[PDB]
Every structure is written in C-alpha cells, then in structure tokens.
Design a protein around this ligand. Structure first.
Ligand SMILES: Cc1cn([C@H]2C[C@H](O)[C@@H](COP(=O)(O)OP(=O)(O)OP(=O)(O)OP(=O)(O)OP(=O)(O)OC[C@H]3O[C@@H](n4cnc5c(N)ncnc54)[C@H](O)[C@@H]3O)O2)c(=O)[nH]c1=O
Ligand SMILES: Cc1cn([C@H]2C[C@H](O)[C@@H](COP(=O)(O)OP(=O)(O)OP(=O)(O)OP(=O)(O)OP(=O)(O)OC[C@H]3O[C@@H](n4cnc5c(N)ncnc54)[C@H](O)[C@@H]3O)O2)c(=O)[nH]c1=O
Ligand code: NA
Ligand code: NA
Ligand code: NA
Lengths: 210, 210
C-alpha cells in the first residue's frame, strides 16, 4: 500500500538530427493508444521551461553559451522532469520520450569536444529507460531533411562526429539499433515487434548509469 | 605573445548564510585598490543572468525545483562566468569572489542530501582560486542579522548540516579558517595578514578539483 514500483514502460528514441524521432514516437504512441495502453509523450529538450527557454535560444543561435554551461542546462532540463516522469510510471502510464541523456553525452562530446565522463556525471541517477531505439541514419542521409541547417548542430561535419560518439552506447543491453533509412511504416513495425516482446509486469526503478 | 599564464590572484570567500562575506570582501577589495592591485569583485550566485534569475527565484521561494535541477544551475552559473574570470586573471586583474564551488558542495549535500562526489563533478574543471577564506561562525550564531530567514536555507537546523559538510574542506592547502565571530575590523586584519603573504608572479592555471 506504500508502493514504490515502476509500472509503466519507459521508451526512449535516440538519433541524429532530423532522424525521424518525432515521426516514429507519434506513431508508437498512436499505436499504444489503440491497445488499452496509457502513455504520455515527452521530449528533450523541453523548450517551454525557464531552463528550457535558454536551451532553445542557444540552439537557434539567438545567444551563445560556453560548452559546460549549455551541457549542464540540458541535464537540468531532464531533472526538472524526473517527478513528472516518475509519477507517470508509478501510476502505470507509459512514457515515450524523444531524446534523453544519450543525446546529452553524444552531442556534447562529439560536437563540443567535452570529456565523456564529465558529460555523463550530471545525468547520473536519472531514471533508466527500458529501451532505447537508436534510429540510425548516416550523417549525409540527414542533410536532405526538410529544415536542415536551421539549428546549431545541423551541419554535416558535426553530425559526422556525433554519429561516432553515439557508439559509446551500443554495448547497453537496452540499446536497440534501428536502421532508420526506410519507409516510415517499416521502421514502425520493427519498433512494434520490439515493444510487444517486452513483458508488462511491475518492477523496481533503475537509474543511470549502471 | 601566445601566452596563457595566470597573472592575477583569485580569492574566494566561503561561509554560512549572513556570515559577513559581502562585508569582508568589500574591505579586501578596498584594501587591494589602495596598495595598487587591479581587482574585480564577483559573487555567486550571480542572480542577474538568465540562469541566476532562476536561482534567485528558487532561493526566495518564488519557485521550487528539484534538488538536482537547482544544483546544476548553481554550477552552470559559474561556468557561464569562466570566460570572464579567465580573461581577467590572464591580464593580471585580481578576482575577489563572494562564494564559489565549495558553497555548491557544502550546501547541496548538507541541506539537500546529495551525494558529495555527485555534487562536485559538475564543478570539476573550473578555475581554482589561490586562497579560500572561510568565515567560520557557529551554525546558530548568525540568526539575528538583518534579513535572516527571508531565504531558503536560513533555518537553524539547515545551517547545522551545512556547517558539518563545509568541514569536508577544512584542512586543505588553499583553505584558511577565519574566526568570523569577531568585530568586522579584527576579521579584516587577519585577512590582510594572509593576503600580504602572496607571491605576485605569473603561473599556470589550476583547476578543480586538483
Ligand atoms: C536532449 C539534448 C539535445 N541536444 C541537441 C541535439 C539536437 O541537435 C538539438 C535539437 O533538438 P531537437 O530534438 O529539436 O533536434 P532534431 O531531433 O534534429 O529535430 P527534430 O525533432 O525535428 O528531428 P526528428 O528526428 O524528430 O525528425 P522528424 O521530425 O521525425 O522528421 C524529419 C523529416 O523527415 C521525415 N521523415 C521521417 N521519417 C522518415 C523516413 N523514414 N524516410 C523519409 N523521411 C522521413 C519527416 O516526416 C520530416 O519531414 O539538441 C543536446 O545537445 N543535448 C541534449 O541533452
Ligand atoms: C554559490 C552557491 C550558493 N548556494 C547557496 C548559498 C546561499 O545560501 C545562497 C546564496 O545566497 P547569498 O550568498 O546571497 O546570501 P548569504 O550567504 O546570506 O550572503 P549575503 O549576501 O546575504 O551576506 P553575507 O554572508 O556576505 O553577510 P554580509 O552581507 O557581509 O553581512 C551580513 C550582516 O551582518 C553584519 N556583519 C557582517 N560581519 C559582521 C561581524 N563580523 N560582526 C557583526 N556584524 C557583522 C552586516 O552589517 C550585515 O547586516 O545559495 C548554493 O547552494 N550553491 C552554490 O553553488
Ligand atoms: Na524530435
Ligand atoms: Na543567504
Ligand atoms: Na554574500
């Protein structure tokens, strides 16, 4: 009756810029809703919060910030959401989340040359997701995307480095590589095949990075 | 000509709430200007910035935030200043600083119950000061001073836990314990005495947490 168990499932999309994360998670969520499964759609960065408004401005080059300043904002933005998320998952509501601490590490080490550990430390103790679908597109695949170049990191050479740093996570048992250069529909079914593989049962919360 | 040495000295004050840090540093700056040193007065948190504004609001109880959200903001706030303080110290301007990283560790783990290491990590890599002046007073000492209680940690029980965690720095190279229970001018005196002790010569930059 004093229950502290995670009851929803936590699903994260990771990927390079414009890689289809909104496209996929919308659909996943939509699929989850036609199957008696409850789910909230989240995303990082959340540009609505105080902290979030500053991240946005950085991304849009309306301001500039130092590497370590912006990195810690991205991380704080995830912690300002931990209760929300924890609450949802306690209640049995699934969370499908577009970007997370991986983005944080991939981007900052890749694009801003920060040290990976340094980059990881702030995000330690955030809730561990049950799965990450890394939508995988090659950096030069991305550029053909509709709004490519409008935001700070969307330059081929930069994505090129971010693509390489993302492999820092390939060895995780929840890291699921998805070849994302396809028909939206194909990618979608893979995700589905993979989400029903998971068994629905209550369990203790886990935290990064362990 | 391609020179990256530190030519200014960098002095932090640490202490519990309302200990006399602003007071003691207005004095040290005054003194430094007389005896011909160029010096800039800084303070943390710097409430005036996009981030500081959020910290301010937090401290006044105009918002709440998770512990981790706020702690990374305190850190971010110092990183957004490093470019400035590095330029100053590069040129030979001294920096006198009201509060720094130590505040972040002592407060966060003491008042908020965060893991020490985790608290330090985000500050790892900031410029190291030369000397820290800790204005030691007993935890219940300061409670009569003009505005005490207006801001979040200004509770006797909370001060005690902070006092215990500041000890984690107590007997270190750069750490200088000052009995700040005294009349202002006697405190000032003991500071100047240790300040005259400094060697003025250029040197390598040092970083937290070495
Ligand atoms: C969390 C975090 C983020 N960042 C950095 C990383 C990012 O560079 C940046 C902006 O954050 P963002 O999430 O807005 O950046 P993007 O993800 O690039 O922006 P999008 O959200 O728009 O990208 P999506 O991956 O959602 O792409 P999507 O909107 O789904 O689709 C793009 C286009 O492609 C089509 N499309 C979708 N799937 C397709 C497919 N399979 N085949 C062909 N076309 C496909 C879509 O319909 C759309 O037109 O922030 C950090 O540095 N640190 C951090 O901690
Ligand atoms: C940087 C950082 C801060 N914090 C926390 C620590 C803090 O709780 C709060 C910031 O808050 P603050 O630093 O603005 O507020 P205080 O620490 O209380 O410092 P103040 O700016 O309020 O004042 P001081 O401590 O400098 O005290 P001062 O302004 O010198 O004077 C206090 C009063 O006492 C008198 N006084 C001063 N010295 C006296 C003496 N020796 N004897 C008798 N009286 C003395 C003065 O006239 C004044 O009224 O945030 C974190 O949690 N993490 C972080 O990383
Ligand atoms: Na997205
Ligand atoms: Na105070
Ligand atoms: Na002060």
């Amino acid at each position: 009756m004093t229950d502290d168990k995670k009851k929803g499932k936590f699903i994260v999309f990771e990927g390079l810029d414009r890689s289809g994360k909104s496209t996929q998670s919308k659909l996943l969520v939509e699929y989850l809703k036609n199957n008696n499964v409850e789910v909230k759609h989240l995303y990082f960065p959340n540009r609505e919060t105080g902290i979030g408004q500053i991240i946005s401005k950085y991304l849009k080059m309306e301001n500039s910030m130092s590497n370590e300043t912006i990195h810690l904002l991205f991380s704080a933005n995830r912690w300002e959401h931990m209760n929300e998320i924890k609450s949802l998952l306690l209640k049995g509501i699934w969370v499908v989340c577009d970007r997370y601490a991986y983005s944080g590490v991939a981007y900052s080490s890749g694009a801003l040359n920060l040290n990976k550990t340094w980059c990881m430390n702030p995000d330690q103790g955030l809730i561990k997701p049950d799965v990450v679908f890394y939508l995988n597109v090659p950096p030069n695949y991305a550029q053909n995307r509709s709004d490519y170049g409008e935001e700070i990191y969307e330059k081929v050479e930069t994505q090129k480095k971010i693509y390489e740093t993302y492999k820092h996570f390939a060895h995780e048992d929840y890291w699921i590589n998805i070849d994302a250069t396809r028909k939206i529909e194909d990618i979608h079914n893979d995700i589905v095949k993979e989400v029903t593989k998971i068994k629905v049962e209550p369990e203790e919360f886990n935290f990064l990075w362990s």
